[PDB]
Amino acid sequence: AMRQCAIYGKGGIGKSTTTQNLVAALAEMGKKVMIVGCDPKADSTRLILHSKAQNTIMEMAAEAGTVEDLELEDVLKAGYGGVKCVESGGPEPGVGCAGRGVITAINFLEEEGAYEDDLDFVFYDVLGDVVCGGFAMPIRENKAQEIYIVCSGEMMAMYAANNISKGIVKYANSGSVRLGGLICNSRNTDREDELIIALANKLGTQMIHFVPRDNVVQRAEIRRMTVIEYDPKAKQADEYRALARKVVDNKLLVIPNPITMDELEELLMEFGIMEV
Amino acid sequence: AMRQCAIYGKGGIGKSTTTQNLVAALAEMGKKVMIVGCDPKADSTRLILHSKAQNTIMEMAAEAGTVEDLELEDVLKAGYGGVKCVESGGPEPGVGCAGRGVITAINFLEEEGAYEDDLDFVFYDVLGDVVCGGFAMPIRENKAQEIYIVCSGEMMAMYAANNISKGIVKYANSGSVRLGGLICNSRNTDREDELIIALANKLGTQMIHFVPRDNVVQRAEIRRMTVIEYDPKAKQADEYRALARKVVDNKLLVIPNPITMDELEELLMEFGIMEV
Ligand SMILES: Nc1ncnc2c1ncn2[C@@H]1O[C@H](COP(=O)(O)OP(=O)(O)O)[C@@H](O)[C@H]1O
Ligand SMILES: Nc1ncnc2c1ncn2[C@@H]1O[C@H](COP(=O)(O)OP(=O)(O)O)[C@@H](O)[C@H]1O
Ligand SMILES: [Mg+2]
Ligand SMILES: [Mg+2]
Numbered sequence: 001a002m003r004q005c006a007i008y009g010k011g012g013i014g015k016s017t018t019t020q021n022l023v024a025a026l027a028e029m030g031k032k033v034m035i036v037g038c039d040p041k042a043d044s045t046r047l048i049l050h051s052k053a054q055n056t057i058m059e060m061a062a063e064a065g066t067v068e069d070l071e072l073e074d075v076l077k078a079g080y081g082g083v084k085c086v087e088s089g090g091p092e093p094g095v096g097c098a099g100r101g102v103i104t105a106i107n108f109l110e111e112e113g114a115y116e117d118d119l120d121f122v123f124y125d126v127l128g129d130v131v132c133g134g135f136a137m138p139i140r141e142n143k144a145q146e147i148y149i150v151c152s153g154e155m156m157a158m159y160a161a162n163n164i165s166k167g168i169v170k171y172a173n174s175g176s177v178r179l180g181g182l183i184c185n186s187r188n189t190d191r192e193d194e195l196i197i198a199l200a201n202k203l204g205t206q207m208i209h210f211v212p213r214d215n216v217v218q219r220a221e222i223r224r225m226t227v228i229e230y231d232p233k234a235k236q237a238d239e240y241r242a243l244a245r246k247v248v249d250n251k252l253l254v255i256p257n258p259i260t261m262d263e264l265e266e267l268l269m270e271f272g273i274m275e276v
Numbered sequence: 277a278m279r280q281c282a283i284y285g286k287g288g289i290g291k292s293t294t295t296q297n298l299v300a301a302l303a304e305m306g307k308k309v310m311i312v313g314c315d316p317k318a319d320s321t322r323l324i325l326h327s328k329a330q331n332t333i334m335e336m337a338a339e340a341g342t343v344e345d346l347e348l349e350d351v352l353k354a355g356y357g358g359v360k361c362v363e364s365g366g367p368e369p370g371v372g373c374a375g376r377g378v379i380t381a382i383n384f385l386e387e388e389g390a391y392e393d394d395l396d397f398v399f400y401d402v403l404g405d406v407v408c409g410g411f412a413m414p415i416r417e418n419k420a421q422e423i424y425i426v427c428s429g430e431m432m433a434m435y436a437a438n439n440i441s442k443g444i445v446k447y448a449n450s451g452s453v454r455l456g457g458l459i460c461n462s463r464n465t466d467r468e469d470e471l472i473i474a475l476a477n478k479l480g481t482q483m484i485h486f487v488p489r490d491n492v493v494q495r496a497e498i499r500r501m502t503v504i505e506y507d508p509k510a511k512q513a514d515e516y517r518a519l520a521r522k523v524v525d526n527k528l529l530v531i532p533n534p535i536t537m538d539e540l541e542e543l544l545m546e547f548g549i550m551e552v
Contacts, residue, residue, distance in 0.1 A: 010287050010288065010405075011286050011287060011405050011432050011436070012286065012430060012431070012432030012433070040406075041435065043537075052537070052538075053537070091408075092442060092446070093407035093408075093412075093439045093440065093442040093443040093446065094407050094408070094412050094415065094416060094442065094443035094446035094447060095408075095446065096408065097373075097408050097409065098406035098407070098408045099406075127405070127406070129286075129287050129403070129405035129406065130316075130374035130375075130403070130405065130406055131369035131370050131374070132367075132369075132370070132371075132372065132373050132374045133373065136369075136370050139370065140370060154288060155288070156287050156288030157288070159317065160287070163369045164369065166368060166369040166370065167369040167370035170368070170369065170370035170371065171370060218550045218551070221550075222545075222550065261319075261328070261329070262328075269498075274494045274497075274498065275494070
């Protein structure tokens with residue numbers, strides 16, 4: 001068996017930093033993991049690969065002819081801890097649907113046997129500002145059973161978490177896609193942990209971990225590494241290890257209860273975020 | 277004549293706060309303005325209307341039968357300074373293309389004579405995390421000649437500005453859509469103004485204004501107002517007046533020069549943003 005997980009959230013919230021660091025911690029533990037990049041920014045694997053980024057399936061298929069002229073062993077690349085990495089890519093801005101490459105990539109990986117029995121986890125790193133096209137495909141087509149949403153005390157980040165939750169509810173009549181938890185990626189604001197716990201409770205889930213804001217992240221990423229690899233003794237490395245442990249142990253996977261805009265604003269006022 | 281402008285940028289960067297405050301300043305000056313909300317969040321007019329939000333064309337058309345059973349005078353609403361306001365709306369998450377309501381809304385407004393000769397400005401407030409579907413329509417279909425991109429020293433916000441610029445370039449062979457400037461909506465980071473000026477120069481545009489981070493924004497918005505209306509004497513009100521004046525006076529409208537990821541990272545290192 002293997003656990004198929006997706007990390008969603010608004011742009012810039014910390015999906016790729018959190019995913020790569022979480023996965024490095026899982027690999028450090030002895031788990032076998034694949035990361036599938038599902039964001040057109042296409043830098044979701046660079047910290048595992050020590051790289052600028054990774055060439056995408058869409059780019060590689062165009063240079064080869066068709067996606068069928070690609071070989072899996074040419075596409076997947078392994079980095080830190082043996083973690084396997086692939087990027088979907090997507091059309092250029094203004095050209096066609098931004099999510100179209102996700103559909104091509106996931107179907108290619110399934111057809112070509114990338115989901116080998118020895119994997120313990122797959123993580124999709126998915127753009128979450130809109131829930132449509134290929135970005136909704138991991139939910140609509142039952143590819144990721146465990147959705148973890150990275151968010152913060154920012155109103156926009158909580159709105160995104162609510163919208164992703166609505167997408168999960170919409171497709172709950174078939175498949176088994178569920179909300180697994182919220183990950184608070186801190187902005188250093190007062191009562192932010194309490195706020196995201198409260199939001200998680202309203203949605204029916206949990207806040208699986210509070211990730212502190214720590215400049216060691218920037219220092220590791222300048223050097224194209226996870227914190228786990230850059231400084232295994234760092235306080236922040238232990239934070240990612242705690243998140244990984246709780247993901248491994250998590251058994252709460254729910255059909256969430258999306259909330260109203262009024263409820264979101266009440267949360268913000270209650271925990272004095274707008275009044276800090 | 278009337279100047280058709282669109283405000284683009286990544287989610288949560290400050291599009292709606294900046295647009296409504298800029299437009300309130302224009303109205304305070306004696307200009308006649310319409311705001312067209314092109315973001316599914318659909319709260320792009322609430323500070324002009326003193327409201328929770330505004331019911332959307334998609335919602336109103338569903339309750340009426342077809343969009344053709346709607347009347348313009350039933351749809352457009354006027355608030356502070358006589359500013360006219362409309363929201364496009366969009367399908368729910370997981371259901372169809374998130375941008376589809378923008379196409380319906382803009383076509384309805386054109387057909388029904390909303391672009392009356394007495395308007396001085398129209399501002400579209402457009403989601404910019406993806407440049408496709410209805411979100412690309414103002415560029416692809418020549419609806420907004422002047423694009424202003426709200427951004428910050430955040431890497432993701434600058435990447436979004438670059439992606440929007442690529443969309444402008446893609447459609448430059450017809451129509452007259454141009455990049456008018458970058459608006460820096462500050463994160464209180466050192467050298468942020470210098471960074472966005474440098475990015476603007478690389479793209480071929482200008483940084484039209486540096487908007488400071490100021491808590492008066494939160495206090496005004498809790499009360500459903502622009503800063504212009506909430507406290508006309510506030511320092512931040514004068515900041516929005518300066519931005520409005522420079523928009524009125526701006527004559528630089530370019531086909532931009534998108535940059536590489538390497539150039540973006542160099543900008544970040546040069547101005548010590550990641551090392552603050
Ligand atoms: N916990 C953290 N502490 C400090 N910086 C962070 C943290 N998480 C993310 N960042 C920084 O935030 C920026 C955006 O994160 P990223 O994971 O790329 O966002 P996304 O993938 O959601 O667009 C990156 O520069 C990253 O280094
Ligand atoms: N200059 C500013 N100073 C302080 N807070 C701001 C400023 N600009 C925006 N904000 C706050 O940032 C949040 C997001 O802004 P908004 O305009 O809604 O973003 P967008 O429309 O781009 O998603 C809002 O809570 C807003 O009040
Ligand atoms: Mg990312
Ligand atoms: Mg907005």
